[PDB]
Amino acid sequence: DVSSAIQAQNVQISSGQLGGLPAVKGQQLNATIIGKTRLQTAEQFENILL
Amino acid sequence: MSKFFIDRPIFAWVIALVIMLAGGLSILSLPVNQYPAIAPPAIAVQVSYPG
Numbered sequence A: 001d002v003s004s005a006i007q008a009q010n011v012q013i014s015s016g017q018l019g020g021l022p023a024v025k026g027q028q029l030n031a032t033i034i035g036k037t038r039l040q041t042a043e044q045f046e047n048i049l050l
Numbered sequence B: 001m002s003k004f005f006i007d008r009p010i011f012a013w014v015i016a017l018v019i020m021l022a023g024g025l026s027i028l029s030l031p032v033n034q035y036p037a038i039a040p041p042a043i044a045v046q047v048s049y050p051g
């Protein structure tokens, strides 16, 4: 259960792109969207709901 | 030589003609290009970690 929890709770959000091609006429602002990386601290780990 | 070849100018010619013949037939199969390979070899590593 713990293994599975950590696997669902300590992942990278893959993240797309705002104004990705193909885009609609206009667009104007093209910027990458960065999501969350992964847990780093020992705490972040002690967290994670089981 | 020289003295040898001065009284043997056919022989003289023939050493010249062989050299020319050899070097001639070579011009027929040499690679041609602007410059020789004068650039440092580089090897490239690529991966994409998506997003």
Ligand SMILES: CCCCCCCCCCCCO[C@@H]1O[C@H](CO)[C@@H](O[C@H]2O[C@H](CO)[C@@H](O)[C@H](O)[C@H]2O)[C@H](O)[C@H]1O
Pocket (backbone or CB within 6 Å): B001, B002, B003
């Ligand atoms: C980096 C690689 C290079 C490889 C290529 C090597 C080739 C070099 C060629 C040199 C050979 C020359 O050989 C040369 O023959 C002629 C023949 O007339 C001689 O010529 C003359 O020598 C003396 C000096 O006045 C006289 O006594 C003589 O009467 C006269 O004939 C030379 O004594 C000899 O030195």
